[PDB]
Amino acid sequence: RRSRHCPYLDTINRSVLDFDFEKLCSISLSHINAYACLVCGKYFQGRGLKSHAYIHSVQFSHHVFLNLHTLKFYCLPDNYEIIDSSLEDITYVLKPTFTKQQIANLDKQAKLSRAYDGTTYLPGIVGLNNIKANDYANAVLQALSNVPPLRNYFLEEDNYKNIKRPPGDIMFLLVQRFGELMRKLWNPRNFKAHVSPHEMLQAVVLCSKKTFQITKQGDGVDFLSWFLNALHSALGGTKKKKKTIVTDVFQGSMRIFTKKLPHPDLPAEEKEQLLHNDEYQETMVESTFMYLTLDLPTAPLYKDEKEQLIIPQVPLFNILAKFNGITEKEYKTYKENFLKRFQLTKLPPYLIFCIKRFTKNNFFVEKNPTIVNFPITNVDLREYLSEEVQAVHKNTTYDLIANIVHDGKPSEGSYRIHVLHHGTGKWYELQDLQVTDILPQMITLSEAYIQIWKRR
Amino acid sequence: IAPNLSIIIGASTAAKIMGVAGGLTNLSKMPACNIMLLGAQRKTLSGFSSTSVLPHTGYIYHSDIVQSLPPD
């Protein structure tokens, strides 16, 4: 058996293999026995005489191919299995085998990884390819990354297969493709220092239908609101899993006291009787949040008298002062206003802060470009919880992990991401493939849009 | 040493204008027009209007009291 040795081992080109495309046959549009040539990097239908792979092998004289399901290499022109010590490296690219020790020894990792093309990088800090208006998708995927509670559930393929999938389950592909993409980007050894979400946006547009179409730039907040919900709903078939891997990470309990009919059309005596009626008062409205919303002061709309066109800088604690009994916001809707006061009763391990920049006016949608001064490694949130709950939590301090910054008008945007490499303190800026170790001040200077924390 | 001058402009700019003037006695013999130009750098205009790079501007023009006012 000449299977083990091959006189065509050197013809393989490792920098041409781009395994981020759809694993379907190019010639005849099939996923069965997807075989990839290594000389040039094309997909085929499988082995066998007069097969598309065989025809290509006997036409281009490309001998050694690769199986994308059994992960076992073959020489099609004579069609025998190929086993080599070096060739194993290629198998680590498409299907990275992250054993539990590598997950356990990755937050303590401070060595820059090696790429075959020579483009140095750090795992996790990887540029997601912007094929078509994927700036928001890349931003949310990177922000969802670097979350150790979520980081330690997808680097192993044996974590999400065991879940029950109903016959009508049409969203498990989202979970499995998220896991595979995360393994591709967290790969210590890959040919390209970047990775294309081409296999991921397809699952996104299949699960979310035409919504979040990659033609037009999507909304980050509207995206992750559906994304975390879809991750929660996929995990668990015909079984109410109120707490799943993503629920016990970002979800937190929240209290709301809501009063209604404060409308000015009511006279003083009628409103006094209304509040006397005991029908319209603060109510028990405790629920769950996947992410805390932040409402900003409106743009100054006027030049400052001394320094014209002053940049509006507001401390973060002013925004977070909404979540306490002291302040109450009037979420007026339709005919009667609704005065709601917010409160925190269960801090999630990681706190998400979405920021309401983009808002529609009476006529046209604008953005609120109000800069916020926010720390990154020391914040206290103990004032926002009732003492009958404050005793439970001995950790109310959060450290920033990921930050989302948007550019320009809503119809013309380009997301940028500030990621913190845990273990070290290097804050890296990624837009499409950008890599730059910024200082902890450029994070404050820019206008944030979505922030990720960690209670430690 | 100069309680009256140190409160109108503040002690910092007061020191900057008394040290460069050669002492309180020296600047007491100095007209206010010249006291304006105390420490007035002849900044090289970088292909701009001379109005853009403050011309004939001294430490008193950079004091906290005046900067509180609109540029005009």
Curated annotation (Swiss-Prot), chain A:
EC number(s) on file: 3.4.19.12
Subcellular location: Nucleus
Result when mutating C207A: Complete loss of CHK2 and NFKBIA deubiquitination
Binding site for Zn(2+): C37, C40, H56, H62
BP terms from Gene Ontology: cell division; mRNA processing; mRNA splicing, via spliceosome; protein deubiquitination; RNA splicing; spliceosomal complex assembly
Any one GO molecular function term: zinc ion binding
Gene Ontology cellular-component terms listed: nucleoplasm; nucleus; spliceosomal complex; U4/U6 x U5 tri-snRNP complex
Zinc fingers (UBP-type) by residue: 4-101
Span of domain USP: 126-456
Catalyzed reactions per annotation: Thiol-dependent hydrolysis of ester, thioester, amide, peptide and isopeptide bonds formed by the C-terminal Gly of ubiquitin (a 76-residue protein attached to proteins as an intracellular targeting signal)
Keywords assigned: Cell cycle, Cell division, Hydrolase, Isopeptide bond, Metal-binding, mRNA processing, mRNA splicing, Nucleus, Phosphoprotein, Spliceosome, Ubl conjugation, Ubl conjugation pathway, Zinc, Zinc-finger
Function of the molecule: Deubiquitinating enzyme that plays a role in many cellular processes including cellular antiviral response, epithelial morphogenesis, DNA repair or B-cell development. Plays a role in pre-mRNA splicing as a component of the U4/U6-U5 tri-snRNP, one of the building blocks of the precatalytic spliceosome. Specifically regulates immunoglobulin gene rearrangement in a spliceosome-dependent manner, which involves modulating chromatin interactions at the Igh locus and therefore plays an essential role in B-cell development.
Subunit record text: The U4/U6-U5 tri-snRNP complex is a building block of the precatalytic spliceosome (spliceosome B complex). Component of the U4/U6-U5 tri-snRNP complex composed of the U4, U6 and U5 snRNAs and at least PRPF3, PRPF4, PRPF6, PRPF8, PRPF31, SNRNP200, TXNL4A, SNRNP40, SNRPB, SNRPD1, SNRPD2, SNRPD3, SNRPE, SNRPF, SNRPG, DDX23, CD2BP2, PPIH, SNU13, EFTUD2, SART1 and USP39, plus LSM2, LSM3, LSM4, LSM5, LSM6, LSM7 and LSM8.
Family: Belongs to the peptidase C19 family.
Name of the protein: Ubiquitin carboxyl-terminal hydrolase 39
Species this chain originates from: Homo sapiens
From Swiss-Prot, chain B:
Disulphide bridges, residue numbers: none
PTMs per UniProt: Phosphorylated by PRP4K during spliceosome assembly.
Stated family: Belongs to the PRP31 family.
Function: Involved in pre-mRNA splicing as component of the spliceosome. Required for the assembly of the U4/U5/U6 tri-snRNP complex, one of the building blocks of the spliceosome.
Disease / disorder: Retinitis pigmentosa 11: A retinal dystrophy belonging to the group of pigmentary retinopathies. Retinitis pigmentosa is characterized by retinal pigment deposits visible on fundus examination and primary loss of rod photoreceptor cells followed by secondary loss of cone photoreceptors. Patients typically have night vision blindness and loss of midperipheral visual field. As their condition progresses, they lose their far peripheral visual field and eventually central vision as well.
Compartments where located: Nucleus; Nucleus speckle; Nucleus, Cajal body
Protein name: U4/U6 small nuclear ribonucleoprotein Prp31
Tissue: Ubiquitously expressed.
Entry note about domains: Interacts with the snRNP via the Nop domain. The coiled coil domain is formed by two non-contiguous helices.
Organism this protein belongs to: Homo sapiens (Human)
Positions bearing the site annotation: Interaction with U4 snRNA and U4atac snRNA: H56
Record's subunit section: Identified in the spliceosome B complex. Component of the U4/U6-U5 tri-snRNP complex composed of the U4, U6 and U5 snRNAs and at least PRPF3, PRPF4, PRPF6, PRPF8, PRPF31, SNRNP200, TXNL4A, SNRNP40, DDX23, CD2BP2, PPIH, SNU13, EFTUD2, SART1 and USP39. Interacts with a complex formed by SNU13 and U4 snRNA, but not with SNU13 or U4 snRNA alone. The complex formed by SNU13 and PRPF31 also binds U4atac snRNA, a characteristic component of specific, less abundant spliceosomal complexes. Interacts with PRPF6/U5 snRNP-associated 102 kDa protein.
Recorded consequence of changing H56 to A/K: Reduces binding to the complex formed by U4 snRNA and SNU13
Domain Nop: 1-72
